[PDB]
């Protein structure tokens, strides 16, 4: 089964995210930097300070779903995902709760801009965030996915309400705007070089070695490929020393 | 072959580190935070400002060696590693060169505290660092491994010369001292919680989902286990949703 080959390729990165103190230190580092950024942020007169935050693998830890995929040789499946969301077993990314609550009690507002589905995944999402200790998880704070996965228009909606976004937190570059949405990794890397100065300042990164826009970035039409085509794209992407 | 199963488990994390703009953004974020830390660092009168930096997967990118392991189903092998080092094809972790040069030209000194071998890996190391553009790669800047892998005694040696280490940069928690050297991941995670405030400040983390002290941290005597025992430890470490 090519599906076993596909999920086994995630095992080491899953181990790292789930078990290592290194992963946790990177989460703390991101949220420590995010606090400094928020403290220093200067906002135009008339505006209120907003922080925009992605959820999955930024504030919520869905690693148990990945653990289930590995154990059962399952590729991603939207219906399996909703059952996970409704299981209400999401964990918190280290640092995230304390950061969220800090912002919200110090003249800011965190907005959750997320591609969990507004229709079917809102309830489990809000339940888990309350349980995990996030302050300000009222409906109005959430900009969940409707039709589009691209996030900029939701950022814009927030700006329409007299907020100035002072920072953006995410594990995916598409959490920072639409510049490289649906683009291959060369373009995505180019965006990062162009915006080098913003990282750890206006753009706050969380680590995610398991999935994301970088995965689709491995090859043209990657997500439309079958399991074998996806494995091939992963393997063809490998940069290797010749052994000499 | 269990050895194929072992290296295939690294593929996705290797793809991430090698190809994603996200990895690069995390490297920039770490080095942007490191610059802020260095700018603000206050040192006791009489002392000179030191920065201590690990090399492999902190300032030097050895991902092509990992790419060769995957392509050839090879576990880690010290002799293969030296040939890689002597190949002189090391790449630079994004941000690292600019950070190193900044410190060294602004009343600081970067010291390279590294477990590349002093005897046999020094020459290739220095060659690659000069080629990559690191300033101050004279012999005296390097504290390469002799007998011990633990790093604290080398940090102490630096402190003996009238330096105060203002920050430490690494991809491994053992790059920050000896508190959790050779310990399992629970202890390692506990260290991170105890030192939560230092991350992105005094302790600067780089991402490494491919290998490290966290790998040995998966199980008691992990590095002494055969390939099958190591795969088992990885798999047994997986935290999984029950699917309901
Ligand atoms: Mg996310
Ligand atoms: Mg290292």
TrEMBL record, chains A, B:
InterPro entries: Acid_phosphat_B-like, HAD-like_sf, HAD_sf, Lipo_e_P4. Keywords: Metal-binding, Signal. The keyword Chaperone does not apply. One of its GO terms (cellular component) is cell outer membrane. Pfam families: Acid_phosphat_B. GO terms for molecular function: metal ion binding. It comes from Haemophilus influenzae (strain 86-028NP). Coiled coil: none annotated. The lineage of its organism: Bacteria, Pseudomonadati, Pseudomonadota, Gammaproteobacteria, Pasteurellales. NCBIfam families: lipo_e_P4. Mg(2+) binds at residues 54, 56, 171, 175. It comes from the Bacteria. The keyword Phosphoprotein does not apply. This is Outer membrane protein P4, NADP phosphatase.
């Amino acid at each position: 089964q090519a599906n076993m080959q596909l999920q086994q390729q995630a095992v080491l990165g899953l181990n790292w995210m789930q078990d290592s103190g290194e992963y946790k230190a990177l989460a703390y580092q991101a949220y420590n930097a995010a606090k400094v950024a928020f403290d220093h942020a200067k906002v135009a007169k008339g505006k209120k300070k907003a922080v925009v935050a992605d959820l999955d693998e930024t504030m919520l830890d869905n690693s148990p779903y990945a653990g289930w995929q590995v154990q059962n040789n399952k590729p991603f499946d939207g219906k399996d995902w909703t059952r996970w969301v409704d299981a209400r077993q999401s964990r918190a990314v280290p640092g995230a709760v304390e950061f969220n609550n800090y912002v919200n009690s110090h003249k800011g507002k965190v907005f959750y801009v997320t591609n969990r589905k507004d229709s079917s995944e809102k309830a489990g999402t809000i339940d888990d965030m309350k349980r995990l200790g996030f302050n300000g998880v009222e409906e109005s704070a959430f900009y969940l996915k409707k039709d589009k996965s691209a996030k900029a228009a939701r950022f814009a909606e927030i700006e329409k309400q007299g907020y100035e976004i002072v920072l953006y937190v995410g594990d995916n570059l598409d959490d920072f705007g639409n510049t490289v949405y649906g683009k291959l990794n060369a373009d995505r890397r180019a965006f990062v070089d162009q915006n080098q100065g913003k990282f750890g300042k206006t753009f706050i990164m969380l680590p995610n070695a398991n999935y994301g826009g970088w995965e689709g970035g491995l090859a043209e039409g990657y997500f439309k490929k079958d399991t074998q085509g996806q494995i091939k794209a992963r393997l063809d992407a490998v940069q290797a020393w010749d052994g000499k």
